Every structure is written in C-alpha cells, then in structure tokens.
Amino acid sequence: PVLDLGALGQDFAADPYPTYARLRAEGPAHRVRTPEGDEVWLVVGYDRARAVLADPRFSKDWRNSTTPLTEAEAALNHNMLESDPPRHTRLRKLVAREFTMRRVELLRPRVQEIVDGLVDAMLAAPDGRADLMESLAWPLPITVISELLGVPEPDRAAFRVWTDAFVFPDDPAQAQTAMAEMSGYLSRLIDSKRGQDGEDLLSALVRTSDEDGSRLTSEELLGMAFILLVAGHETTVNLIANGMYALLSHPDQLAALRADMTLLDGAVEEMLRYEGPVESATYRFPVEPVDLDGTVIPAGDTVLVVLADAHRTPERFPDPHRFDIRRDTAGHLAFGHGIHFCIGAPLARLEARIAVRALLERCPDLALDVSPGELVWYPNPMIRGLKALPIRWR
Ligand code: HEM
Ligand SMILES: CC[C@H]1OC(=O)[C@H](C)[C@@H](O)[C@@H](C)C[C@@H](C)C(=O)/C=C\[C@H]1C
C-alpha cells in the first residue's frame, strides 16, 4: 500500500522515529505519501541508506525523473547537488578550494566575531530570556555565507523569508513565488557584480562564467549562487537549534560538556547523529528499475534516503535513542555520503562549535525555557527543525 504521512499530524513531525523504525522492520524501501501530497519512496535502515547515497544507479539529475519541474524550479536546477558526473564533477571543482578545512580555518576569527556580537545582543535582554532561533541560530549562518558570497546586508532579510517558504509554505503557490523571486534577485545580484572587480566568491564566479561560458554557463552561475546560499542555510540553522535543544533536554550531557569543554567536537558530532537537521536526503531517481530486497523501485521515481532512521539503527549506533556526547559517531550520514558529501561540512562544524561553546561559556545556568512537549517541529520530510527555541539564563 501507500502509507499516508500527513495523516499522522504533528505527532509524526515531532517524533517520526518509531514510524521509520516500523517500516525498517518490514523492509528497506516503502511507498509513502508526504504531508504535502507527494508520492515518494523511503529508504530506511543504515546499511541500505549509506549504500543508496553513493549508488550511481540513484541519479540526482532531474532529466532522469518523471516528476515535472515548474518554470521557477527549473531555473535554479543547474547546480551541483542536482547533477551527476561529469557535470557534478566540473561544477564542484569550481569552488572546492573555497571550502577546505585550511581555508575555512581562516574564517574562524570572523565567525567568532559574529558569534560574540550576537551573544552580546542576546545577553542584553533584561529578563534573561530569548528565542535562540532568532538570536543566534538564524543570523549566524546567513551572515557568514552572505559575506563569503557577497550578499549585501539589506538583502538578507528577504532571503530568509524565501528559504522559509521552501520548507513550510502556507500553500504550494507560496513556494513557487519565493523561487521565482529568489531567481530574479540572484540574477540581478550577479549582474551587479559584473565589472566591479569584487573579490567575494560570487564576483569570482561571474568572472569565471564571463571569460568561458562552457566552463560555467549563466544558468549554472545562477544555480551555483543558489545552491551555495540555500543548501547550508536551513541545515546549519537547525543544527545549532536541534543541537542546543539536545544539550538542554539532556541535562547530564550539558553538565558533562560544561565540566570538560574538550568534549565539544565529539558533542557536535553527536548532535549531528542524534538530531541532525537533514531528516531525509534530497531527491534521487533510479536510472533503471532497482531491486531492493524484492522491492523494485521503477526508473524515474522519487527516492528519499531517510538519514534519521539510519542514525537510529541499533546495529550501527548501539542504544540509538541515547544522546551521548562521548559516543563513537564515526560513519554517520548527517553530511551525506559519496560524491555529494557536503562541501560545507568544515564550515558548518566551525560555526556550530563556536556557537555551542559561546552559549555554554557566556550563559550561566542556561536552560530550556519551555517544556519539550510544547516545542513545535516543522513537518517537512527533508528537514528536522524547530519553530522556536526559548531559552533562559542568569
Ligand atoms: C549542519 C550543516 C549542514 C548539514 C547537516 C548539511 C548536509 C548536507 C547533506 C546531507 C548533503 C548531501 C545531500 C544529498 O545527498 O541529498 C549536503 C550537500 C551540500 N551541502 Fe551541506 N550541510 C550543511 C552545511 C552546509 C553549508 C554551510 C553549505 C554552504 C557552503 C553547504 C553546502 C552544500 C552543497 C553545495 C552541497 C551539495 C554538494 C554536492 O552535491 O557535491 N552545506 N549537505
Ligand atoms: C543540503 C541539502 C538541503 O536541501 C536542498 O538544498 C534542496 C536542494 C532545496 O530544494 C531546499 C530548498 C529544500 C528545502 C526543503 C530545504 O531547506 C532542505 C534541505 C537540505 C537537506
């Protein structure tokens, strides 16, 4: 049959794991209907999830999908995440040097400065209370990526409204309108760099496209700006929020980290394992019928690798539902796996590490200012994210 995910309401959005685990008991692949009405395949179970993410039979090029693209969707589609080799290879090579650990490490002073200023403003609240999402989780990643790419400050607010419509639109037409608006804005921003001799990443990309259109077409120039600004926004925002929620709702772990801040890196890894922002990977399309344990997924269908269920597979992560900052987290799929492994992983880790350390060191008696049952989780099947994260201190 086809399991209806939308018929489970906020209960599934808040705690989807028993649903996924139930399906994994029956097999690796399952036809479901998303809360928004999309008929898709779910791939569950760690070993299968990891294998499918790197299986070249599961393409990311939309030319291999039987799902139609709107005009707005197609305009942003020429990007590395929605490509196979050789196009994926050519596109990622253009910006790979920008995101290595060595290069990202040169951003640590600026990231620390951004975090310091945002925490300063948060601590200015007289009642010692704040929404962590608004105070730190949203502004930090959009500030970093905007300075790297060259998005002027007055333009960034509208950018966050758009990506919000991508995840939780009030209706499907609102997602379409935001896509057309972001496409129009990005093309204008690309135009504004032309001939201005800027040294931001977008300025270099415009130059690259202009002097050889076969190395980076104008559609791919637009798609590159788009994917670099969008792919890391909702993810990094929700890693900080989900991770802080994990720390604040497991007080034993918060105390362990407070008493030994060298556990920080291992704690961020477990935040990725336990409550990573990517619940399911982006769309994959079998180039041919693929047999998964007697379940055959036909060519062109939409396949979602449920990363969240892979991280709760007991054979791979023993005692899966325990948030343990000292856990062996090696092999988690929070950044994906294969040729599409997150290009921004060093940057995301840098932002998350600095953000967590700042809160723990500068918010005395930091605590969750609402009950976990009162939190509201967004129902998007790809993103695990909170509506807000009320906190208190002092
Ligand atoms: C906590 C933060 C992040 C998480 C959990 C995350 C997660 C992921 C995942 C799971 C994928 C692969 C998706 C798929 O296979 O379906 C991916 C790819 C990608 N991510 Fe991230 N990401 C994060 C941060 C960032 C940041 C900050 C940037 C911006 C520079 C970024 C840029 C990208 C790009 C461009 C790709 C596509 C790479 C390619 O296809 O080779 N990510 N990310
Ligand atoms: C790092 C990959 C991201 O997904 C995207 O960037 C897809 C391509 C995009 O449609 C974005 C806009 C899809 C929406 C639902 C989003 O914010 C989700 C997810 C991340 C997993």
HSE, CB side, 13 Å, CA atoms: give it for residue 249. 19
Protein residue closest via CA to atom 39 of ligand 1: 340
Dig out the tokens for 94 from the structure: 């253009």
Residue 276 is encoded by which pair of tokens? 């990573």
C-alpha 166 – ligand 2 centre gap (Å): 8
**Helix 345-362 × helix 251-259 angle, to 10°:** 90
DSSP string, 73-96: HHHT--SGGG--TTHHHHHHHTTG
Nearest CA to ligand 2 atom 3: 231
Experimental technique behind these coordinates? X-ray
Q: Containing H/E element for 259?
A: helix 251-259
Report in angstroms the alpha-carbon separations of 244 from 197, 270, 294, 374: 40, 11, 41, 16
The bridge status of strand 29-33 relative to strand 58-59 is unpaired
CA 54 to chain centre: 18
Q: Are 148 and 201 in contact (CB under 8 A)?
A: yes
Concatenated DSSP letters for 183-226?
HHHHHHHHHHHTTS---SHHHHHHHHHHH-TTTS-HHHHHHHHH
The dihedral region occupied by 336, where left means phi > 0, alpha psi between -120 and 50, and beta the remainder, is left
Ligand 2 lined by 175 (C-beta under 6 Å): no
* 367-368 and 285-286 beta bridge pairing: unpaired
Q: Which helix (H) or strand (E) holds 114?
A: helix 108-123
SS3 223: helix
Q: Are strands 129-131 and 58-59 parallel, antiparallel or unpaired?
A: unpaired
Is the Cβ atom of 52 under 6 angstroms away from ligand 2?
no
Do 208 and 192 form a contact (C-beta atoms < 8 A)? no
**Which atom, in ligand 2's list, is nearest to the CA of 278?**
21
Burial class (CB in 10 A: 0-12, 13-18, 19+), 217: middle
Q: This structure's resolution (angstroms)?
A: 2.2
Other C-beta atoms closer than 10 Å to the C-beta of 314 total 11
What kind and span of H or E run contains 218?
helix 218-230
Say how far apart CA 377 and CA 4 lie, in whole Å: 18
Parallel/antiparallel/unpaired status of strands 390-392 and 129-131: antiparallel
Which is it for strands 39-43 and 58-59: parallel, antiparallel or unpaired? Answer: unpaired
**Contact call for residues 24 and 309 (beta carbons, < 8 A):** yes
The domain segmentation of the chain, as residue ranges, is: 3-392
Integer distance in angstroms from the first to the last C-alpha of the chain?
53
Answer positive or negative: Cα dihedral of 264, 265, 268, 269: negative
Burial class (CB in 10 A: 0-12, 13-18, 19+), 208: middle
How far apart CA 64 and CA 81 sit, in angstroms, is: 14
Say how many Å lie between the CA of residue 235 and the centre of ligand 1. 8
In the CATH scheme, what is the code of domain 3-392?
A: 1.10.630.10
- Residue given tokens 């929700």 in the structure block: 238
